[PDB]
Design a binder for this molecule. Structure first.
Ligand SMILES: Nc1ncnc2c1ncn2[C@@H]1O[C@H](COP(=O)(O)OP(=O)(O)OP(=O)(O)O)[C@@H](O)[C@H]1O
Ligand SMILES: Nc1ncnc2c1ncn2[C@@H]1O[C@H](COP(=O)(O)OP(=O)(O)OP(=O)(O)O)[C@@H](O)[C@H]1O
Ligand SMILES: Nc1ncnc2c1ncn2[C@@H]1O[C@H](COP(=O)(O)OP(=O)(O)O)[C@@H](O)[C@H]1O
Lengths: 479, 501, 51, 478, 145
C-alpha cells in the first residue's frame, strides 16, 4: 500500500507490521504522522535496521516515543532517509531528518542526498599527505595535524575537549576558505548553544546575512532518542559528503561526540533483539565506526578534514569504543585527568597523543628532534614522579634532577591560554606560532632558560611573554 | 459541622455532570507480578497513559507488545483481580501546577503529603515536556549564589547552569544542597528540593530545618518514601522538572535539587528489569543515560523571547568508594554542566565543604558569576590547583625555594580561607571581601591558623564600619577603586585590631 | 659511615616493605580483576540468554 | 472458607498454585497449604503469594520446608495477609516466622493479632526531635552518636565483631532506658540466638515464670530457615515493634541482625521467581524491599522505634548494593573494618565512615561536636599518612607528623573499649564509660596530658583514669 | 575406624553427588548425635562442595550471583552447618561439633565462600602457607584465629 501497523513499541524501538504486498528494505525512513497527545498533526520519523519476519519490521525512531500508539499507520518513503544538502543548507541549525530547528524560515529543500551511502574506496581517497598547523602550541608541536587527515580528541570526563573544539574552530574556521560543518552529535545542548552564540558573535555564521556562512550547524540532542543520535552523525557526515563530492571543497567537520553515537547505537541494539558485546557496547561497534571513518576520507575529488571529540567513559583506553576509535584515527590527542588536575590546559597526555604526521622528513629534521627530546624528558619525568613521591626530588640524583625540573617547566609552558577560555582563566588567550613554540622549547630542553621560575611558564603563549612574566615574578619576589 | 450545609454543593456537583459519550480503551489485566501489570487486550493505549485499575492504584504503560502491555503500578496494587477491567485514562501523565504548592510536601502523583490541604490547580503539565529549543535559549550569563564560599569562588553556579553536586555518601551533600537552597532568601529563586529514595525521617529533618530557616515558604519538596513503588520513585524527578517548568515558563527563574539521582536510576532499573527490558552494562538498563538526559535537559536558562528565567539544576549523584568509574556517575558527568566532588578525605580533613578543585570543575565559568569577583580572582582557581600540586610536591620539603615557599604559604592561607563554619551563608560581598583579602596578600604575613578569626573580625568590622561598600558593589557588581579603598582601609584597621590582639 | 648505614637500613627496610606491599597489591589486583571480569561475563551472558 | 483448590507447580522453595477462575487471592496475602507428611497432614505448610501468573494461577513463596507436598494438594486460601500474634503474648516468648511459639511454651492467645505488613507510616507521623541517647561504648559515644527513634546501622563483614557488639549493646540497654525491647533475628546463628536468649534469661530481663512481664519479644528467625521464612521474619519483628509503638505507644528497642540475610533470601527467591537478576547477584527489587523494611521503621509521634540493625557486608565490599541501599536508608553508619580486628582492637571500628547526622553541634553541644572533629581530623590525617608510611618506614616524616601519628594511634588504641560480655571470650571483664569520660579522655589525649605513656597504656581500657592506673602498673612492672 | 564412618566421594564423582554427600554425612551424624552420643563431623572440603553446587546450579541454568556463585549457597551451607549443634538433656544432650574444612585461596578471606562460611560458624581457625613453609607445623596463626 504501503500502510502497515506498529505491533510493538518498546522504548524507541518500533515493531512495525506490514501486509505481505510490501515489506520495505533496510534503512528506509518511515513516518508515523498526524497524531499526538493534543490531537496534533505531529509526525515522528523512524528508520529500520532489523526486519523480524512475517512481513514485519522493528524500527528505530528519530524522535520521542510519546504520541504514537500501537496499531497506527506508517508511511515509508520507499527510500532511505535523505538529508537536505547544499549551500542553502549552510547557516541554519537543523535536525537529523533535516528540519531547520532554527525556528525561522526553512532552508530550500530541493537537493537531498540519502543519509546512508557508499564509502569512498581508497582509489578515490586522496593519498596526498599534508601538514596542518592550528596555532595551539602542544598540538602543532607534538601532535601536528594533517590538512586532510582524521583528527581525534580522546577526551576525559569533561575536561578540555569541547572547549578545545571551540578554540580550534575559532582559530581555523576563518583560516580555511573552504566550507565547514559542525556536527552536534549528542552534544550538550546549552554548550552547543554557546558554540552557536560564538558563531553568531565571530560572524562565522553571519547572523545578519546567511548562506555565506562557510560553517554549517547541525545538532542532535542528548535528550533526543538514541534513534535520533544513531543517525545525526550520519546526517552531519552526509552534509560534509555532499560538500566533499558535489561542492568538492576543503571541508571541516567537528563532530562531538562520537562516543555519543556509539552509546546510542549500543543503547538501541540492546533493545532491538540483539545480544550485548564486551563492556559498554553493541556488537556492531566496529562496523559503525567503519561506516563513519570510511566515509570521512579526503578524496582525490575533494579534500576533507574531519576533527572529532572522543569521550571515553571511565577515562581509559582499554574501553572497546576507543579501542576501535584509535584504530580508525590518524591524529589522536589524548587528554589527561592528571594534567587537568594540575590545571595544565589542554590537559593532553603527550606520551599518549601522537600522530602519523610526526615524521621527521615531514615536520623538519630539527622540529622532529625538538619533539623527540621533549617527549623523552617528559616520559622520563612521568617515569620518575612515583619514586619522587616516596623518596624526594632532592634525593633523586642530579642527572635526572635537572631533567625533572626541566620537564616540569615544559608541560606548564605548553599549557597555553585560549581566546575563549579567558572566562575560565582570567587572561585572554594567545594564538601561538609553531616557530615561537620550537624556539621556546629549544630554549627549555637545551637548558638555557633553566634560570627562570617554573610558574613563569605557567599559562603563557610565547616564551618572550614567559621571560616577561619571569621578570615580573622576580620583581614581585623583591616586592 | 455535620449534615448541615454541603448538600447544595452536592446538588451542584451531581446536576451538571458529564454523561459523556467517551469511548475508552479498556484492558482485561492478565499478568500482574511484583509491581508490574502485563495486561491482555488494551489495544489503543498510548505508551505513557495512566491506566486506571479496579483499585485506584493507577499505572503508566511503559512497554507494549503485540499481545501484552508493560504497565507499572504507581501505587502498589496489593489486590488486583485477574481479568479486571483496567482502562486507560487517555491523558498522558499530566501534572497540575500552581504557586500554592510553595511549601507543601508533595508526592509524585501531585499529591500533598504535607498535611496542609489539597491544592487548587489549573494547568495540566506533561511529564515528558521536552527541552527548550537550541536557538531559543541564551548562554548562562547571569550569576546565581550558593552561600558556600568555595563553590562560588572557584567553580561557580549560574542561573540556568546545571552544576552537578557529586561525591561519596555521608559527606554533607544534602547539607550543602539545603544550604544553597536557604541561601536564596531575596533572590526570587524558587527551589524544588526533589527528595528521592531516602529516609522520610531525613526529609522530615530537612523540612524541619526549612521551617526553622523560613525557607519553606517558597520551596517545594517532592518527597519519596523508600517504601514507594519504584515507578513512583523514579517518576518523581520528572514531576519536579515539570513543576519547575511551570515557574520558569512565566519569567521566574528557579532552582531544583534532585536528591538523589542514583536512587532514581536504581528504581528505574528495577522497573525496567521487572518489565523484562534487557539490561545494559553494570546490570543497569542502558537508557538511564536517556532518562537522565531527558531529565537534566529540561533544566536550562530561558532567553528574553520567552521569559529569561532559568532552571539551574543540582542533581546529587551517589558514588561508592569515591569512584567516578561507576555507570551512573559516568553518564551524569557527561550530561551535566560540570561536576563538584565531596571527597571523604577533604570532609573529614576539615575542608567543609570538601570541593577539591583538582577534580571538581564548573564548565561554563565566570560569566555565570559576578564581575566584581571575576576582576578580583578569576585566576585563583588555577592558582589553587597549582598550590594543591605543589603541596603534594612539598612532601619533599628539605630546601624549598623562597618563591615556592611564598607560593605554598600563600595557597595554604588561601585554603584556610576556603574553610567556613556549618550553615554560615556569607554575603556575596563578604565572599568578595575574603577573596580580595586572599588575593592581595594581606594575610600572607599574618597568622596562618588564625585566618578564620581574622576573617570573622574583618567581616564584622566592615559590616559595622563600611557597609556602604557592600551596597555600592552589589549595585554595580564591579570591583572598583572605591571597593579597593574601603577594603584596604578596613583591612589596615582590623589587621591592627587583631595584631593587638 | 653512620649516615650511609642509616640510609642503608632505611633502604633495607623500604625494599622489604615495598615487596610485601607489592604482594598485598598483587593479591588485591588479582581479586579485583577476577571480580570485575566475572561480573562482566555474568552480566553479558545474562543479557544474552535473557531472550 | 475462601477459595480452595490445587497447587499446580512446585519449584523447590517456590510454588505455583492454580485456583478457581472466578476469584484469585490478593497479592502479598498469605494462605496455608494442607498437603501431606509422614504422620498426619499438618498445616505446617504455610505459604504466601508473590505473583499471580496467568491461567488463574498464582506463583507463591513458601514459609517452611517444602518436601513431601506435591502439586494438586488441597490448598486453602486464608484470604487475609499473614496474621501474627501481637501484644503481651509476645513478651518473652521466642516465637517464629508465622508467630507460633517455638519456645516450648503454650500457644499464645490469638485475641490480638495483626497482618504481616502494612503501608508506610505518614509524613506527619514521623517525629521531629533528633533524639540521642548514649550507650557506653566510647567510640560510638565519641564519633558516631545514635539517633534514637531513627535507624542505627551495624556494618562490616564476618568475623569483625558485629553480633558481639549487638550483644554488648543489648547488654546495656536491656536494663537501661527504653520500654519494650524486641529483638529480631534475621538469619541468625540459632545457637547464638538461644545464647542471647539464655543471656536474657540469666540477666532476667525476660521472665521465667509470669513471662508477660518481660518487655522483650525475642522473635528470632534462624539461619537454617527456608528463604521465604528468612524473607518474612524481619516483617514479623517490625510488626511487633510497630504494634508496640502504636498500642503500647512505647520507645521500642529494635535489635535486628542481619538484614543482608533478609535481602539475600529475597535474591535467592527471585532467582526462582524468574525475575531477571540485578547488580552482581541480587534481586532487582532489593531497593524496594529495603525501602519497606526501613520506611516502616520510624520514630512515631509517640513511639521512638530505635532500631539497631546489622548488615552483613559481603566480603567487605562497600560498593555492593546491599550496603549501598542501607547506609542511605539509615542514620548511624557503623562500619567495622576487618583490618582493625586483624590488628586486634575490639570493637574494630574505623572513624572515617562510621558516622551520623547526630554528630552535629546543635544536637551534641558544640563542645562534643568539635571533640569528635579533633578526633576525626587527626585520624583521617593518620590514614592519609598511613598509606605512605607503611612503605618506607616511620621516621621520614616531620616531627609534627610523627607526633600526630603517635597521638592518632593514642586515640585509636584508646578507643579499645573492653566489653562486659566479652569477658568470657577474651578474659578481661569489660568496663562502662559515659560522656564525662567521652570528653575527658579526648581532652587529655589532645592536650598532651597523657603524652609519654606507651601505646599499651590505654589499650583495652575505656576510662582514661583506668588507662592512667594501667600505665602506673606497667611502669611499675619493669 | 570404629570411631569414624568415612564418607568419600572424589573429584570423579558428579557435582550433584559431591553436593549431596555432606548432606548425607550430616544426616547420619544427626542420627548418631540424636541417639544420645557426642559426634564430630569433618566436612573436607566445603569449598569443593561450593564449587560442586555452583556447577550443579549452572547446569540448572539458574543465574549465579556473587563471584558467579548462586545466592542460594549461604542458605545451602546453613543447612549442613546448622544441623550441627549440642542438644540439651531435654533430648539427650548429644553434640555435633563440626570441622568444616574450607580452603581459602591465597589468603583472600574476603572471598565469597570463605566469608560466607565464616558468617555461619562459631569462629575462624587460621592456617597460613607462610607459617607452614616457615617450619611451624601446624601453621595456625593465633593472632586472628
Ligand atoms: N560546612 C560544613 N561544616 C560541618 N559539617 C558539615 C558541613 N557540611 C556538611 N556537614 C556534615 O555532613 C554530614 C552529612 O550530611 P549529608 O547527609 O548531607 O551527607 P550525604 O553525603 O548527603 O549523606 P546522604 O547522601 O546519606 O544524605 C552532616 O551531618 C553535616 O554535619
Ligand atoms: N568485642 C570483641 N571482643 C573480643 N573478641 C571478639 C569481639 N568481637 C568479635 N570477636 C571475635 O570474633 C568472633 C565472633 O565473630 P564476630 O563477632 O567478629 O563477627 P560476628 O558478629 O559473628 O559476625 P556475623 O554474626 O555476621 O558472622 C569470636 O570468636 C571472637 O573471638
Ligand atoms: N585548565 C583548564 N583550562 C580551561 N578550561 C578548563 C580547565 N579545567 C577545567 N576547565 C573547564 O572544562 C570545561 C571544558 O570541558 P570539555 O571537556 O572541553 O567539555 P565537556 O566538559 O562538555 O566535555 C570548560 O568549560 C572549563 O570550564
Amino acid at each position: 500500500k504501503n500502510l502497515g501497523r506498529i505491533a510493538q513499541i518498546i522504548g524507541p524501538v518500533l515493531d512495525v507490521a506490514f501486509p505481505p504486498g510490501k515489506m520495505p528494505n533496510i534503512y528506509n525512513a518511515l513516518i508515523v504522522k498526524g497524531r499526538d497527545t493534543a490531537g496534533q498533526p505531529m509526525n515522528v520519523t523512524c528508520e529500520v535496521q532489523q526486519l523480524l519476519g512475517n512481513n514485519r519490521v522493528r524500527a528505530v525512531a528519530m524522535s520521542a516515543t510519546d504520541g504514537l500508539t500501537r496499531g497506527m499507520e506508517v508511511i515509508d518513503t520507499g527510500a532511505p532517509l535523505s538529508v537536505p544538502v547544499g549551500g542553502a543548507t549552510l547557516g541554519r541549525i537543523f535536525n537529523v531528518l533535516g528540519e531547520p530547528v532554527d525556528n525561522l524560515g526553512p532552508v530550500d529543500t530541493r537537493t537531498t542526498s540519502p543519509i546512508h551511502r557508499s564509502a569512498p574506496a581508497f582509489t578515490q581517497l586522496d593519498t596526498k599527505l599534508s601538514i596542518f598547523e592550528t596555532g595551539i602550541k602542544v598540538v602543532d608541536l607534538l601532535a601536528p595535524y594533517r590538512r586532510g587527515g582524521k583528527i581525534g580528541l580522546f577526551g576525559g570526563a569533561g575536561v578540555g575537549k569541547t572547549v578545545l573544539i571551540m578554540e580550534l574552530i575559532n582559530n581555523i574556521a576563518k583560516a580555511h576558505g573552504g566550507v565547514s560543518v559542525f556536527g552536534g552529535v549528542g552534544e550538550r545542548t546549552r554548550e552547543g548553544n554557546d558554540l552557536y552564540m560564538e558563531m553568531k558573535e565571530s560572524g562565522v555564521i553571519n547572523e545578519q546575512n546567511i548562506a555565506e556562512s562557510k560553517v554549517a550547524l547541525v545538532y542532535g540532542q542528548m535528550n533526543e532518542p538514541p534513534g535520533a543520535r544513531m543517525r545525526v552523525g550520519l546526517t552531519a557526515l552526509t552534509m560534509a559528503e555532499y560538500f566533499r563530492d558535489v561542492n568538492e571543497q576543503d571541508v571541516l567537520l567537528f563532530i562531538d561526540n562520537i562516543f555519543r553515537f556509539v552509546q546510542a547505537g549500543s543503547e538501541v541494539s540492546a533493545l532491538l533483539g540483539r545480544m550485548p558485546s564486551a563492556v559498554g557496547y553493541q556488537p556492531t561497534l566496529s562496523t559503525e565506526m567503519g561506516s563513519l571513518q570510511e566515509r570521512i576520507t579526503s578524496t582525490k575529488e575533494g579534500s576533507i578534514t574531519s576533527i572529532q571529540a572522543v569521550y571515553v567513559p571511565a577515562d581509559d583506553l582499554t574501553d572497546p569504543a576507543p579501542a576501535t576509535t584509535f584504530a580508525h584515527l590518524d591524529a589522536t590527542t589524548v587528554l589527561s585527568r592528571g594534567l587537568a588536575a594540575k590545571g595544565i590546559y589542554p590537559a593532553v597526555d603527550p606520551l599518549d597523543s601522537t600522530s602519523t604526521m610526526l615524521q621527521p622528513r615531514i615536520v623538519g629534521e630539527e622540529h622532529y628532534e625538538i619533539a623527540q627530546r621533549v617527549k623523552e624528558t617528559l616520559q622520563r619525568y612521568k617515569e620518575l614522579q612515583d619514586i619522587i613521591a616516596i623518596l624526594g626530588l632532592d634525593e633523586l640524583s642530579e642527572e635526572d634532577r635537572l631533567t625533572v625540573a626541566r620537564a616540569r617547566k615544559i608541560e606548564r609552558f605548553l599549557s597555553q591560554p585560549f581566546f575563549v577560555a579567558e572566562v575560565f582563566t582570567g587572561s585572554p588567550g594567545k594564538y601561538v606560532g609553531l616557530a615561537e613554540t620550537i624556539r621556546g622549547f629549544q630554549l627549555i630542553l637545551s637548558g638555557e632558560l633553566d634560570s627562570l621560575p617554573e610558574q613563569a611558564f605557567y599559562l603563557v603563549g610565547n616564551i618572550d611573554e614567559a621571560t616577561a612574566k619571569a621578570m615580573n615574578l622576580e620583581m614581585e619576589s623583591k616586592l | 459541622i455535620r449534615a448541615d450545609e454541603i448538600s447544595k454543593i452536592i446538588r451542584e456537583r451531581i446536576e451538571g455532570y458529564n454523561r459523556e459519550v467517551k469511548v475508552v480503551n479498556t484492558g482485561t489485566v492478565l499478568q500482574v507480578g511484583d509491581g508490574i501489570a502485563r495486561i491482555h487486550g488494551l489495544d489503543e493505549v498510548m505508551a505513557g497513559e495512566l491506566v486506571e485499575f479496579e483499585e485506584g492504584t493507577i499505572g503508566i504503560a511503559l512497554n507494549l507488545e503485540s499481545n501484552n502491555v508493560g504497565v507499572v503500578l504507581m501505587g502498589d496494587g496489593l489486590m488486583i483481580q485477574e481479568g479486571s477491567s483496567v482502562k486507560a485514562t487517555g491523558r498522558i501523565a499530566q501534572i497540575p501546577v500552581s504557586e500554592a504548592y510553595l511549601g507543601r510536601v508533595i508526592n509524585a502523583l501531585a499529591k500533598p503529603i504535607d498535611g496542609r490541604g489539597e491544592i487548587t490547580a489549573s494547568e495540566s503539565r506533561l511529564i515528558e515536556s521536552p527541552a527548550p529549543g537550541i536557538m531559543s535559549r541564551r548562554s548562562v550569563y547571569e550569576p546565581l549564589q550558593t552561600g558556600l564560599i568555595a563553590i562560588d569562588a572557584m567553580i561557580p553556579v549560574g542561573r540556568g547552569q546545571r552544576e552537578l553536586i557529586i561525591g561519596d555518601r555521608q559527606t554533607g551533600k544534602t547539607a550543602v544542597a539545603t544550604d544553597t537552597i536557604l541561601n536564596q532568601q531575596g533572590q526570587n529563586v524558587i527551589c524544588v528540593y526533589v527528595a528521592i529514595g531516602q529516609k522520610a525521617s531525613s526529609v522530615a529533618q530537612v523540612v524541619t530545618n526549612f521551617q526553622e530557616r523560613g525557607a519553606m515558604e517558597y520551596t517545594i519538596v517532592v518527597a519519596e518514601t523508600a517504601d514507594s513503588p519504584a515507578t513512583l520513585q523514579y517518576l518523581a524527578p520528572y514531576t519536579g522538572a515539570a513543576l519547575a517548568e511551570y515557574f520558569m515558563y512565566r519569567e521566574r527563574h528557579t532552582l531544583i535539587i534532585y536528591d538523589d539521582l542514583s536512587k532514581q536510576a536504581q528504581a528505574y532499573r528495577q522497573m525496567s528489569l521487572l518489565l523484562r527490558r534487557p539490561p545494559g552494562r553494570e546490570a543497569y538498563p542502558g537508557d538511564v543515560f536517556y532518562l537522565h538526559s531527558r531529565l537534566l535537559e529540561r533544566a536550562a536558562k530561558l532567553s528574553s523571547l520567552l521569559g529569561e528565567g532559568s532552571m539551574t539544576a543540582l542533581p546529587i549523584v551517589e558514588t561508592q568508594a569515591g569512584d567516578v568509574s561507576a555507570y551512573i556517575p559516568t553518564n551524569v558527568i557527561s550530561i551535566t554542566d560540570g561536576q563538584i566532588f565531596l571527597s571523604a578525605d577533604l570532609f573529614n580533613a576539615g575542608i567543609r565543604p570538601a570541593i577539591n578543585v583538582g577534580i571538581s570543575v564548573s564548565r561554563v565559568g565566570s560569566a555565570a558569576q559576578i564581575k566584581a569577583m571575576k576582576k578580583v580572582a578569576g585566576k585563583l582557581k588555577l592558582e589553587l590547583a597549582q598550590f594543591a600540586e605543589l603541596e603534594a610536591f612539598a612532601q619533599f620539603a628539605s630546601d624549598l625555594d623562597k618563591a615556592t615557599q611564598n607560593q605554598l604559604a600563600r595557597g595554604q592561607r588561601l585554603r584556610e580561607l576556603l574553610k567556613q563554619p556549618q550553615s554560615a551563608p556569607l554575603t556575596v560581598e563578604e565572599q568578595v571581601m575574603t577573596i580580595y583579602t586572599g588575593t592581595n596578600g594581606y594575610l600572607d604575613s599574618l597568622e596562618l591558623d588564625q585566618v578564620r578569626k581574622y576573617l570573622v573580625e574583618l567581616r564584622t568590622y566592615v559590616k559595622t564600619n563600611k557597609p556602604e561598600f557592600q551596597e555600592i558593589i552589589s549595585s554595580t557588581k564591579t570591583f572598583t577603586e572605591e571597593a579597593e579603598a574601603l577594603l584596604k582601609e578596613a583591612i589596615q584597621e582590623q589587621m591592627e585590631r587583631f595584631l593587638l590582639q | 659511615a653512620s649516615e650511609l648505614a642509616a640510609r642503608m637500613t632505611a633502604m633495607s627496610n623500604a625494599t622489604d616493605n615495598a615487596n610485601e606491599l607489592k604482594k598485598t597489591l598483587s593479591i588485591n589486583y588479582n581479586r579485583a580483576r577476577q571480580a570485575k571480569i566475572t561480573g562482566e561475563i555474568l552480566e553479558i551472558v545474562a543479557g544474552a540468554n535473557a531472550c
